[PDB]
Ligand binder design. Structure first.
Ligand SMILES: Nc1nc2c(ncn2[C@@H]2O[C@H](COP(=O)(O)OP(=O)(O)OP(=O)(O)O)[C@@H](O)[C@H]2O)c(=O)[nH]1
Ligand SMILES: Nc1ncnc2c1ncn2[C@@H]1O[C@H](COP(=O)(O)OP(=O)(O)CP(=O)(O)O)[C@@H](O)[C@H]1O
Ligand SMILES: Nc1nc2c(ncn2[C@@H]2O[C@H](COP(=O)(O)OP(=O)(O)O)[C@@H](O)[C@H]2O)c(=O)[nH]1
Ligand SMILES: [Ca+2]
Ligand SMILES: [Ca+2]
Ligand SMILES: [Mg+2]
Ligand SMILES: [Mg+2]
Ligand SMILES: [Mg+2]
Lengths: 339, 438, 54, 422
């Protein structure tokens, strides 16, 4: 009989994991402030990692990696990619980004590259965003004059891959689970969060966010249910249209990007020799251009799953992440690597 | 040559001090009867080891130490132990009724009755010093005497020896061997009133020592004797520079200069390696790189915490044995490119290294095996604040209900001192987070 | 990787390796608090003996 | 650090006598006071309960008090009767007639000063007096009425010493008179104010254990007293042998009493067999925490544990003891208050009790003890609402007001426990 606590009521993923654990008859939930727990479904902000692993006779596991915010923050991700030699200043799969603080800061460096785009004829449309409202302007003055009112200005993918019929944008969400041993498991099932409005290069058709599509989009749900296209359908489209497969044209790059990011921070966040163990579910978001090239947009540390996939994914979390540490009485693709 | 006086308070402090001085004698070649054949200057001298030992006309080397306990059973063992001849009765001070794990009882009630006697016995040792450096104070956080009487002694020492340094060796409470439920209370109370009076304090979490004994020594249920023998090794590595010829940490002042840029943040994290079981017939001797890399594994620290999620303010490497500077630098370069070692922007990213060629000494028949080389790292990292967070949380849980508070008020202590001490810890945690996080 | 201040002797040697440059209450006050605590003790004991006398 | 023992009344002296018989055997002391043991652990702390006399005789530091000579003549003629200091027999002739007022105000007042002279004589020769321990019942007149009078006067002369009692609670299952709820209610208030530690021994629980568990169809007081002997020996193990945890009365109180008035403990013992089988450490732990093995007749699952003191006796795996204790708390953490971290302390003693390879003693400060005070309070009110049997007490000078106050005092104690159970 194992024990666990719940310290994040707004978690839709682990609300299901909690429901599954209880149904096994071998897991007993405790009060959120009870220290004698085997497993903690911790809160998003200020999780007390310092208090974990100090219970004699208790193997303690938490569903978050301390220090993983380095990868799940707009400004943090940019700094980690520019400064880490593994990812290097030259990164073929990450859009050219810059960190700009409102009136270290990279304002002057952002204009230098911006000037070369103004100097020599090239697409000069950039996007400004922050972890907390986005602006897509081709003039640097409009972008900077907007941040004043921490942000990150990166190059806007002006030539994205457009699904037909529709001539519309989209992004790919991949769910990756990392267990206490730092095995990297990529969920076989992804989701394309598509835009129901045709792409106009001249903001509803540019932002593929689910909330924006459901409220601001007029043709919401016309092509696919909930502006969500799963891999089986997307793979068929790639074969019928472009005479290729999802695995070859996109999935190879995604698995490459996932490994590179997680292997980069592994020394900083690994709980191999630590007095408590950590696992965490990540939400990677990718953009695909017309050349069938994959770009990393951001990583989510507290992602929500697609409605149809909650059952399969949450069951997989229990199997490989929870029951592997606390055994009771594959839907993932293991991205092998050198520990 | 400048003398150092050791002060052992309470059961933990006395028994730990008993282990350290035993180890000191084995290292300096001093026999249980106080004789030291290698010492050619009879009845005097200003050698490095004379900072811890005085000399009699008969050639006896007497530790510059004082033992204080409110009940006599623990110090009686020293009076009739193997090294009973080292000390004279003036150095062993015992009462009759202990503090009953009550800080207020050791600080106010019982402490007031013996404070002047202890200071007088300390004054007798200070009068034998031509250039007293300061004091090394051993004690626990959880005991009523270790916590309560130490804070009173530290206050008075600042009054009588304002210019002298004071270092602490503090035993952090661990439930696996704890004897009282109120130890969180005593820990925070004694840290509050002692903070302004300690220049540098080395905390030792019994939890960490306990697991190191179970994990690396194969001790199923470690006892205090197992714990103290390992603790004395770490204490020995920290004081060796004061007892042997060298250039790093040669006086108590240098400890503060090298490890404590901020006075309040004066709790360096100690990490020791290797800890090898003497029961293994043969064990592959570890290299400089291997033992230096082990200084960055939490499993070898005196306090379990994650330095990766903090920032360093200083870092000293104390090697004992077959070690040469070239090997250290080679190990440091490798570790720097494989480890997460972040220093505060206003501090240089470097290491002060000290090497003593004499390899570590082990008590004959003990549990630690003889090794060709060992290292003790002293790193002032903000990560050690995790211990304060743990302690302060348990304090909050009990004090919210005023649980056990009547035991302290009954001794003349006011309930306001509780919140006053907790507020001081709250500020202490805030200082650490400012220096360590962005 | 700079090594500085190398000091050697028969029993060992020390040095410093740099990887990167940067970027009290008086005895009177104590006696008052100690005697103040003893006073609150005596007042509490006196009230107990008064209670027992009733 | 010496402890001064006091046993008052019939129940207090019959139980107190068995206690000295049990621990005298554990320390290797024979009926004549001569030591005949084989282990130095028997004599290392023999001073806590024994005085050393001429010829190397060990005389119990015990004071035997009663208002009738009956039970005390039985002790002096008992097995270990000759071991007690003759001067320490202080007794009257009238008796207390199961009347709290007689023991506390009339008959007892006449004799109390004689007892305090013997207590003073014993204390004067103590190097470092820990405190006192009293054995008595609450349903009678002498142990209940005069016992609490002694506690009040002892506290006045020794206010800085610990006061410990083993208090037998009355039960209609094992009852001598109908006025026992009156006597118990009047005494409980005295204990709430003037003791630091009180082991609540419920004659109802002792009876059920003898009947249901030990398979004794017709239990006698002797059978009940056998359980109390084993329990008293277990709870005092940490005081009588070398150890680190709860080694004296004050440190025990500091660990066990988070609030001054909530100092009433549920004792438990294991094993309880009707017998040559070896008991595993996991078995000791489960039985030790089982409600069927506790002496207060309260369901621990109806409340929460403020603090717990466990004592394992015998040669066993201390590693396995740590594992089992951690398994109890971690598997039933809801029954331990979370605002007192690590409120369970465990001690181990190498010397086991007589006739057992290993045993376990449980000492719990549970809020479920209120069920015992509620029970006494209901029985009290059933009679008091009709002022039934009060003439026995008003005839001794008491007023009904004093009964009303005792009633309100215990309902306050019940409310205080219910406060910390939520
Ligand atoms: N490492 C180590 N810790 C000890 C030792 N002795 C006691 N402790 C710890 O110290 C704490 C209790 O403090 P003590 O030193 O025993 O008590 P004290 O200082 O004598 O003060 P009193 O309450 O008056 O007895 C507990 O948490 C113990 O785990 C020891 O020999 N070694
Ligand atoms: N550099 C870029 N090039 C092209 N399109 C971009 C882009 N950056 C963002 N977008 C589009 O704008 C949206 C911004 O998504 P982003 O992840 O930054 O916001 P968000 O954190 O609120 C949603 P989530 O947390 O689920 O990823 C995406 O849907 C993407 O389609
Ligand atoms: N366990 C136990 N309880 C007893 C014994 N004798 C009396 N009692 C209980 O004590 C109460 C009577 O008190 P008693 O000691 O006889 O009165 P006293 O002599 O005037 O103090 C009743 O509730 C009895 O059940 C005994 O030998 N053992
Ligand atoms: Ca000399
Ligand atoms: Ca008369
Ligand atoms: Mg996001
Ligand atoms: Mg002590
Ligand atoms: Mg009777």
């Amino acid at each position: 009989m194992y024990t666990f606590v719940v310290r994040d009521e707004n978690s839709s993923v682990y609300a299901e994991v909690s429901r599954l654990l209880l149904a096994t008859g071998q897991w007993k939930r405790l009060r959120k402030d009870n220290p004698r727990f085997n497993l903690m479904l911790g809160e998003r902000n200020r999780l007390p990692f310092g208090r974990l692993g100090h219970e004699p006779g208790l193997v303690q596991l938490v569903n978050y990696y301390r220090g993983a915010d380095k990868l799940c923050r707009k400004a943090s991700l940019v700094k980690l990619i520019k400064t880490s030699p593994e990812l290097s200043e030259s990164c073929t799969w990450f859009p050219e980004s810059y960190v700009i603080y409102p009136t270290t800061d990279e304002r002057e460096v952002f204009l230098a590259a911006y000037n070369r785009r103004r100097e020599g004829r090239e697409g000069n449309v950039w996007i400004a965003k922050s972890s907390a409202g986005i602006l897509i302007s081709s003039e640097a003055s409009e972008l900077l004059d907007f941040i004043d009112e921490v942000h990150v200005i990166q190059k806007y993918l002006e030539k994205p891959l457009l699904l037909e019929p529709g001539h519309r944008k989209f992004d790919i969400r991949s769910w990756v689970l990392v267990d206490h041993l730092y095995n990297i498991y990529l969920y076989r099932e992804g989701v394309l969060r598509t835009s129901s409005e045709p792409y106009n290069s001249a903001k509803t058709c540019h932002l593929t966010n689910h909330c924006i599509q459901k409220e601001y989009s007029k043709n919401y749900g016309r092509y696919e249910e909930g502006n969500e296209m799963f891999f089986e359908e997307f793979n068929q489209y790639l074969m019928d249209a472009l005479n290729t497969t999802l695995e070859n044209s996109i999935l190879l790059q995604i698995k490459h990007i996932i490994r590179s990011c997680l292997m980069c921070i592994e020394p900083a966040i690994s709980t191999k020799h630590l007095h408590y163990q950590s696992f965490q579910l990540f939400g990677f978001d990718f953009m695909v251009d017309e050349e069938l090239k994959v770009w990393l947009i951001e990583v989510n540390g507290a992602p929500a799953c697609a409605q149809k996939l909650y059952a399969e994914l949450c069951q997989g979390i229990v199997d490989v992440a929870i029951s592997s540490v606390f055994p009771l009485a594959s839907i993932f693709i293991k991205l092998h690597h050198h520990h | 040559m400048r003398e150092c006086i050791s002060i052992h308070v309470g059961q933990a402090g006395v028994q730990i001090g008993n282990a350290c001085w035993e180890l000191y004698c084995l290292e300096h070649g001093i026999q249980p009867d106080g004789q030291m054949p290698s010492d050619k200057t009879i009845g005097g001298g200003d050698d490095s080891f004379n900072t811890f030992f005085s000399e009699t006309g008969a050639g006896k080397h007497v530790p510059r130490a004082v033992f204080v306990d409110l009940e006599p059973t623990v110090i009686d063992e020293v009076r009739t132990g193997t090294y009973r001849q080292l000390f004279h009765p003036e150095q062993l001070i015992t009462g009759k009724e202990d503090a009953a794990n009550n800080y207020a009882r050791g600080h106010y009630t019982i402490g007031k009755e013996i404070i002047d006697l202890v200071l007088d016995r300390i004054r007798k040792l200070a009068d034998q010093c031509t250039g007293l450096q300061g004091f090394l104070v051993f004690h626990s956080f959880g005991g009523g005497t270790g916590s309560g009487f130490t804070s009173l002694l530290m206050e008075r020492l600042s009054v009588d020896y304002g210019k002298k340094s004071k270092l602490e060796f503090s035993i952090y409470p661990a439930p696996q061997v704890s004897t009282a439920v109120v130890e969180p209370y005593n820990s925070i109370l004694t840290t509050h009133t002692t903070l302004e009076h300690s220049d540098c304090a080395f905390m030792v979490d019994n939890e960490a020592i306990y697991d190191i004994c179970r994990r690396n020594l194969d001790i199923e249920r470690p006892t205090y004797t197992n714990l103290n023998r390992l603790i004395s090794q770490i204490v020995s590595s920290i004081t060796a520079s004061l007892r042997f010829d060298g250039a790093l940490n040669v006086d108590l002042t240098e400890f503060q200069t090298n490890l404590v840029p901020y006075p309040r943040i004066h709790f360096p994290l100690a990490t020791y390696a290797p800890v090898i079981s003497a029961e293994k017939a043969y064990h592959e001797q570890l290299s400089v790189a291997e033992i230096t890399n082990a200084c960055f594994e939490p499993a070898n620290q005196m306090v379990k915490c994650d330095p990766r999620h903090g920032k360093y303010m200083a870092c000293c490497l104390l090697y004992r044995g077959d070690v040469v500077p070239k090997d250290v630098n080679a190990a440091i370069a490798t570790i720097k490119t494989k480890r997460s070692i972040q220093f505060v922007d206003w501090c240089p990213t470097g290491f002060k290294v000290g090497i003593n060629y004499q390899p570590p000494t082990v008590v004959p028949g003990g549990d630690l095996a003889k090794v060709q080389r060992a290292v003790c790292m002293l790193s002032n990292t903000t990560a050690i604040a995790e211990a304060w967070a743990r302690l302060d949380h348990k304090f909050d849980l009990m004090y919210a209900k005023r649980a056990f508070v009547h035991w302290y008020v009954g001794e003349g202590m006011e309930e306001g001192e509780f919140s006053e001490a907790r507020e001081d810890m709250a500020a202490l945690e805030k200082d650490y987070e400012e220096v360590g996080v962005d | 990787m700079e090594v500085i201040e190398l000091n050697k002797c028969t029993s060992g040697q020390s040095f410093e390796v740099i990887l990167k440059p940067p970027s009290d209450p008086s005895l009177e006050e104590i006696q008052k608090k100690l005697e103040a605590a003893e006073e609150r003790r005596k007042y509490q004991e006196a009230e107990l003996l008064k209670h027992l006398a009733e | 650090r010496e402890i001064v023992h006091i046993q008052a009344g019939q129940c207090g002296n019959q139980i107190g006598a068995k206690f000295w018989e049990v621990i005298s055997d554990e320390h290797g002391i024979d009926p004549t006071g001569s030591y005949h043991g084989d282990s130095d652990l028997q004599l290392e702390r023999i001073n806590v309960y024994y005085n050393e006399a001429t010829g190397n005789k060990y005389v119990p530091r015990a004071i035997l008090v009663d208002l009738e000579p009956g039970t005390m003549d039985s002790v002096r003629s008992g097995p270990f009767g000759q071991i007690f200091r003759p001067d320490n027999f202080v007794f009257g002739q009238s008796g207390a007639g199961n009347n709290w007022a007689k023991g506390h105000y009339t008959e007892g007042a006449e004799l109390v000063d004689s007892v305090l002279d013997v207590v003073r004589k014993e204390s004067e020769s103590c190097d470092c007096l820990q405190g006192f321990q009293l054995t008595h019942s609450l349903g009678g007149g002498t142990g209940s009425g005069m016992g609490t009078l002694l506690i009040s006067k002892i506290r006045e002369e020794y206010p800085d010493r610990i006061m410990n009692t083993f208090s037998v609670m009355p039960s209609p299952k094992v009852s001598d008179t109908v006025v026992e709820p009156y006597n118990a209610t009047l005494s409980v208030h005295q204990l709430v104010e003037n003791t630091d530690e009180t082991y609540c021994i419920d004659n109802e629980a002792l009876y059920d254990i003898c009947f249901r568990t030990l398979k004794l169809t017709t239990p006698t007081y002797g059978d009940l007293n056998h359980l109390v002997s084993a329990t008293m020996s277990g709870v005092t193990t940490c005081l009588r042998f070398p150890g680190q945890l709860n080694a004296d009365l004050r440190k025990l109180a500091v660990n066990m009493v988070p609030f001054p008035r909530l100092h009433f403990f549920m004792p438990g013992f294991a094993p309880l067999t009707s017998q040559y089988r070896a008991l595993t450490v996991p078995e000791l732990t489960q039985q030790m925490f089982d409600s069927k093995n506790m002496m207060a007749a309260c369901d621990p699952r109806h409340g929460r544990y403020l603090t717990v003191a466990a004592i394992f006796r015998g040669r066993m795996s201390m590693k396995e003891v740590d594992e089992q204790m951690l398994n109890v708390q971690n598997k039933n953490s809801s029954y331990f208050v979370e605002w007192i971290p690590n409120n369970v302390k465990t001690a181990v003693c190498d010397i086991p009790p007589r006739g057992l390879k290993m045993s376990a003693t449980f000492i719990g400060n549970s809020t479920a003890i209120q069920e015992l005070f509620k029970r006494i309070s209901e029985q009290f009110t059933a009679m008091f609402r009709r002022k039934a049997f009060l003439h026995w007490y008003t005839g001794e000078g008491m007023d009904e007001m004093e009964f009303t106050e005792a009633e309100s005092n215990m309902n306050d104690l019940v409310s205080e426990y219910q406060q910390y159970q939520d």
